[PDB]
From a paper:
FleQ and FleN act as master regulators of both flagellar motility and biofilm formation, while using different transcription activation mechanisms dependent on the target promoter and the presence or absence of the second messenger cyclic diguanylate (c-di-GMP). FleQ belongs to the NtrC subfamily of bacterial enhancer binding proteins (bEBP) and has conserved FleQ/FlrA/FlaK/FlgR homologs in Vibrio cholerae, Vibrio parahaemolyticus, Vibrio alginolyticus, Shewanella putrefaciens, and Helicobacter pylori, among others. The protein comprises an N-terminal receiver-like FleQ domain (FleQREC) and a C-terminal helix-turn-helix DNA-binding motif (FleQHTH). In between is a central bilobal AAA+ ATPase domain (FleQAAA+) composed of an N-proximal α/β subdomain (SD1) and a C-proximal α-helical SD2 module.
Due to higher protein yields and increased complex stability determined empirically, we chose again the FleND48A variant for FleN and an HTH-truncated construct for otherwise wild-type FleQ (FleQREC-AAA+). Importantly, the resulting 3D reconstruction features the same FleQAAA+-hugged FleN dimer as observed crystallographically and by cryo-EM in the absence of c-di-GMP, indicating that dinucleotide-sensing effects are mostly determined by the conformational and functional plasticity of FleQ itself. First, the global architecture of the complex is asymmetric with a 2:3 FleN:FleQ stoichiometry and overall increased flexibility. One of the FleN protomers is bound to a single FleQ subunit with reduced occupancy, resulting in slight distortion of the electron density map and loss of signal for the N-terminal receiver domain. The other FleN protomer is bound to a dimer of c-di-GMP-complexed FleQ subunits, in a conformation drastically different from the previously captured crystalline state. Whereas FleN remains bound to the nonhydrolysable AppCp, c-di-GMP is bound as a single intercalated dimer at the interface between the dimerizing FleQ protomers, i.e., in a 1:1 c-di-GMP:AAA+ stoichiometry as opposed to the 2:1 stoichiometry observed in the crystals. C-di-GMP occupies an almost identical pocket and is coordinated primarily by several arginine (backbone and side-chain interactions with R138, R144, R185, and R334 in cis and R151 in trans) and glutamate (Glu330 in cis and Glu332 in trans) residues, whereas the REC-to-AAA+ domain linker inserts deep into the ATP-binding pocket to then thread onto the surface of the interacting FleN protomer. Perhaps most surprisingly, rather than engage in an elongated symmetrical dimer as in the crystal structure, the second FleQAAA+ module establishes asymmetric tail-to-tail contacts again mediated by SD2 and the loop preceding SD1 α6.
Author numbering:
A (entry chain C): 142 to 393
B (entry chain A), C (entry chain B): 8 to 272
D (entry chain D): 4 to 393
E (entry chain E): 3 to 129, 142 to 394
Write the structure that this text describes.
């Protein structure tokens, strides 16, 4: 089993077609689109459809990791490297050596991080902080972001060489507001989680479905999942309509 | 078996955070497994005082590098390897996030925790508390029927949602004089959250106000062992199953969290 | 002319720091002293909750700077001047000592009509706690009759004496069911300090535990004005009478403190 | 001044004690063990009775019940046994409640001391006189003593008392630097000016510049108001800089600029203002090694070393301790605290202490024992374990 | 001292009352009655073993004249203290003088012990010191008074308890004034007999009138060009007081039997312990003499007001022992606090006498609290 999402609209059809376009090769995969559009499941299903199937999948949400700590968890460090290191642990490449690396939120990469990732991509090797050992590992890297890159390089704070190295295989993500027609079916996907995680149940009425479809949905799929689980948890086993939707979700 | 780590929070002081953490850990220990309690109040260690144990070497030694982590695992009641921290040390309170992360990574050495590790977070919404709750898989909120406790719990929820987007929370009621009191408190807190933000919170249980807890604390021993046949002890025992066995089909994801080495594979 | 400031502390949460501070504020107000009440718990707000205040602008708007300190003052019940602290604001949860100063000196501008100031210092031994304790000359430790509270107060005294060398502390017992066990608590603290430290703990009285204070808490009002004919109310009136007997500060200290220009002149 | 109660059933003892009380200059109210209520009814209230001198107890319930009734009449009332001291049969609280025990035939000095203590705690326990004036535990007349170690300090005092340049003070922690600064300020021209003490070690280095000079909003992070710094508060006065070696490197050049040109600035703005602040510094380490290490700049050291002042540890002036032990105790009874009396063994052991902390910890110990076991008979045993030397 | 007080009083109640009164002070007393006073008085070692004789209410037949004659036969130099009654006006003039004080019924402590000190002076006379050192506030105020007074040259008034160290202040003023080369002369009027104060101050005249038995010139030519320090000016009788005012205001005197007037230029420094304006109200003190003398007031503090100085005094006292090789005692901290806590009525004289007695009792010993006399003994 795995985390599953389904759809029928034209945007998600293009999504699967474009995924299958690049699924036949192994290189850096750069994903562009707004945040909360479902990039993690894209990376995991690309891996599940890639050569690596017994290898583990390592996700790294750079928005949930401090900027100074990103290289510490990614590359790894020995026991004695700085004032905060008290134990030698391997970097996240070693834990998933022979798997699939996912690196979300590439927007806030510092220049040392950018050059280090470029070195990792080019020479296929790295080195732990406070050490000189050169270790090489093999992995398939999928980087993701929430800001459009072109402007981000135009600001001059993104290295163009790393931009071109990652953008060899660009990925376009379609926000849900252009594919609202399958949302109901997508809703029937999320209730599967309630039937797969055993945390309650929730239903959606037709009026509720159309009211939800009108909503702008900035952080489309993550906000959809958060809203459905929150509605289920606040009062399970109840009927969901238009009025009891928290706010702005009753756009009718 | 990927290790699930529970952290006890609530912001409001004196709710019972250290006490509920110690008693719940003893409850899981008596109900199987082998818990390894940790107190996140790195400058105010009250787990040892409540348990009556004398820590020869504390977590301040491994913070300063004097000894390894396995050195400070101190056996206590119920077969629990308490990891006491320093008491009365400000230098051990406010650490840089790098040191906190180094501590989280140093926990990876121990591999004798049967999916159990209780964290006793300090009072407040400071950097240490948030850094530890991001590292935990279950965050347990202990709150009492008092509007200041509601305000502090809601403030912690708001901070976590706004900065880090935490979504799932566990609500536990303490110092509730009636079974209806805890549910009313949970209803008020979720009403505030529903009015303002979008966070789902889960019910856990209730700890009634019993003088047995006071008498046991006076005896320098935890209430679970001093008065095992008591309403508070029975409440902790009931909370044991709810804490231990709910996430049976656990799917280990990956971010800055405890035992990430075991979660990856 | 000088302003007496009483920092209500104790490290251990739930001892009643916020409630005792509010009650002392309204008690000195009723005696005939114009009273200011500042919630040093800038991360989480409890003072405005107990007094029912719902300010439209708080200390955050002072700190990131869209107003002055005149606009945030609240005329609460009992003729008190409340300086609310933000609840759940990023700018407030963690502050450098530099910004804590930037608040502290700026707080001395609003000193035209002050007699007594009450500082509700946050729980724990964090940097803000220590800074606000050292910023106040009248430090009162609320101690409950539990060994956890005893050792946590001891840890706070050890932190403030080993590092900064302050020895004066005013011990106020709380949740005491008899007048004798408050003296017993003070004797226990004295024994612990004698065995370890060298400090001068001064007993200031016991606040009896009764449901009046709690039911005042749920009604969102101070027990001094909500229930002025209760055993706790009369005992706290006597405590306030003793508080007025405390001598006024005469000279400023080397470190940062509230109202330096008031004291020096 | 008020009256005294003599609840003694012995006719001879009560008679002679009443005669003695009339001698010493106060009236008396002779009573028995049971009919004291009707005699006390003649007083307006408990304030008119200073203290009671218990003698023989013959009523029902015993001396314990008699003292319970008396404390019910007045809980804040001292107890003065005469003839028979408290044995090991009464409860601990009743044992401690007694101010002192007399020994018939009545002794002069002990009786006046007991009455003076009684009136001290009577004045302390009532609600009159409102608040007082609190002061720091080290803020007493600590320049007392007969040793070479304090005569040298006073000599350098007098040497620098007639100048206005920067002064430098050296000595261990808690040795009495604040008193030195206050005495220098009071005996200088700017006596009426402000005395602002600041210790650079107590406050961190990042905000030390803000505390000293002052800042304004819009050109300072964390700034709220255009505060006038402690240098402005020191205009026409003195700035006592304790623990001076903890200032960062730029702080040294800033202090050099303000000391040489007598003008300073406020951080964030390009404005200058001139003051006449007197800089009296005090440090507890060796600057002759910190300069070589690379922390203390040469010019600032040579500008502050115009008039050095060296203290000495308490252990090097042991024969002064008793003097201080008196001068503290008097202070306490003249502050909002009762009076404490020591035995010969207690002080003899106290003079055997190496004093790892200087006078400051002596004052801390004195206050802690005053508020721990007050109005007692504290001897060598009642002293803490560390101070107990035999 | 070790001497005892005889209590010759017929009133049994007054006898026992005064007995317990004096037993409070720690001095040894013995209760006696006129019917049995003979053998008990004869039971003492000598007539000097008794400091004085205390007489209360007397109801025996024949009056107190016979008792006074019997006491005079017992000992010529024997002070008498009346208790409970004033000085009778029917007693002979030669007998009323031995009555030291007209004390009413047992008085306050200060009056009684001042009378006892006067009796001590009576005993000794019929049978200095480097003070002004320390940093106490009281001595600082006194030093400020010396700085304010020294630059001038006029009368100086000193007020303070008996035996508090006024002589050292007079010496300091004398050596800080323009009369350093001039003699400095102290005269204690209290310690001089009343009938001989005139001879001591004004001088002696050979054969001018009755009573001229001494051949020695007065302090007039001793004080010329210097300082005359007159201690205890309260005991100055009114005729001799107006004579002193004549000597002061006119700055000149005249020898009886001639017409030539002799000028003197002496700086007068009066010092007294009894309140002078209350004595003005009582009318037994001149108005203008006080006004002229009290132009430069020096409020000398008691030893209790400068307790911090006390130890520094002992050292100086101990120093006075080392220079003369007259013993060397070392006080421990216990004795230091025990003496410091004392009230010290005879502020400096009592301390010096105590040091002397301890030196004699324990030569080259560590004076603790046990070796201290009972009156100075202080414990926990
Ligand atoms: N040995 C000793 N005795 C002490 C000490 N503190 C107070 N006393 C005694 O207590 C008396 C009353 O002090 P107060 O109530 O502050 O009343 C004081 C206070 O208002 C003021 N004062 C005196 N000295 C100082 C001083 O150094 N600083 C300040 N700020 N005020 C002072 O003058 C009043 C009268 O002062 P005094 O005539 O000295 O009378 C003083 C003095 O006899 C101490 O540390 N040691
Ligand atoms: N409340 C109170 N506090 C007292 C008293 N005596 C001393 N202190 C405290 O002890 C500090 C040092 O007193 P000092 O050594 O006599 O050092 C004193 C002394 O040399 C001088 N001084 C102050 N007042 C007087 C006074 O009335 N007479 C004289 N002669 N000197 C004084 O000023 C110095 C510094 O005085 P402060 O800055 O006030 O600092 C004073 C004050 O904090 C007192 O009677 N009452
Ligand atoms: N059910 C209950 N009945 C009575 N008292 C209780 C209680 N639960 C907790 N307490 C009291 O709460 C205080 C603190 O409890 P404890 O130290 O176990 O944890 P805590 O987490 O509430 C403290 P903090 O908030 O400071 O971390 C003690 O006085 C304890 O006796
Ligand atoms: N004097 C007293 N008597 C009885 N109960 C008291 C009390 N003081 C406090 N309490 C109880 O404790 C609760 C919390 O009090 P308070 O808010 O003052 O705690 P506190 O401020 O010390 C913890 P924190 O610092 O984390 O806010 C009260 O609502 C009441 O239930």
């Amino acid at each position: 089993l795995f985390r599953s999402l389904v759809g029928t609209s034209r945007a998600i059809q293009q999504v699967r077609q474009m995924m299958q376009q690049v699924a036949d090769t192994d290189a850096s995969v750069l994903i562009l689109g707004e945040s909360g559009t479902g990039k993690e499941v894209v990376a995991r299903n690309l891996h599940y459809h890639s050569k690596r199937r017994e290898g583990p999948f390592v996700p790294v949400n750079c928005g949930a990791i401090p900027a100074e700590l990103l290289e510490s968890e990614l590359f790894g460090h020995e026991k004695g490297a700085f004032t905060g290191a008290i134990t030698s642990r391997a970097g996240r490449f070693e834990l998933a050596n022979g798997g699939t690396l996912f690196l979300d939120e590439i927007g806030d990469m510092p220049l040392p991080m950018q050059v280090k990732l470029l070195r990792v991509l080019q020479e296929r090797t790295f080195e732990r902080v406070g050490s000189n050992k050169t270790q090489n590992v093999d992995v398939r890297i999928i980087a993701a972001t929430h800001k459009n890159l072109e402007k981000m390089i135009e600001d001059g704070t993104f290295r163009e060489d790393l931009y071109y190295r990652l953008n060899v295989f660009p990925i376009e993500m379609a926000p849900l507001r252009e594919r609202v027609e399958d949302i109901a079916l997508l809703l029937n996907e999320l209730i599967s989680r309630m039937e797969h995680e055993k945390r309650g149940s929730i239903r959606f009425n037709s009026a509720a479905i159309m009211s939800l479809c009108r909503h702008d949905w900035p952080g489309n799929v993550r906000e959809l999942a958060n809203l459905v689980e929150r509605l289920a948890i606040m009062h399970p086993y109840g009927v969901i309509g238009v009025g009891e939707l928290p706010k702005k979700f009753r756009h009718v | 078996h990927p290790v699930q780590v529970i952290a006890v929070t609530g912001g409001k002081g004196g709710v019972g955070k250290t006490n509920v953490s110690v008693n719940l850990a003893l409850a899981l220990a008596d109900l199987g497994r082998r818990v390894m309690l940790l107190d996140a109040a790195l400058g105010l260690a009250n787990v040892d005082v409540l348990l009556g144990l004398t820590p020869k070497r504390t977590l301040a030694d491994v913070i300063e590098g004097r000894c390894e982590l396995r050195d400070v695992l101190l056996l206590g009641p119920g077969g629990v390897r308490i990891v006491p921290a320093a008491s009365g040390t400000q230098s051990m309170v406010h650490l840089s996030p790098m040191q906190h992360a180094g501590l989280i990574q140093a926990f990876s050495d121990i591999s004798d925790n049967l999916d159990v590790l209780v964290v006793d977070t300090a009072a407040g919404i400071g950097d240490s508390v948030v850094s530890f709750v991001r590292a935990a898989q279950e965050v347990l909120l202990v709150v009492c029927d008092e509007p200041t406790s509601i305000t502090d719990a809601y403030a912690l929820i708001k901070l976590l949602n706004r900065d880090h987007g935490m979504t799932r929370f566990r609500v536990l009621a303490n110092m509730a004089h009636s079974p209806q009191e805890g549910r009313n408190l949970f209803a008020k807190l979720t009403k505030v959250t529903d009015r303002f933000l979008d966070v789902a919170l889960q019910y856990v249980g209730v700890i009634p106000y019993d003088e047995s807890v006071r008498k046991a604390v006076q005896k320098q021993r935890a209430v679970y062992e001093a008065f095992p046949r008591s309403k508070a002890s029975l409440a902790f025992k009931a909370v044991a199953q709810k804490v231990d066995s709910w996430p049976l089909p656990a799917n280990p994801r990956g971010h800055l969290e405890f035992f990430v080495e075991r979660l990856v594979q």
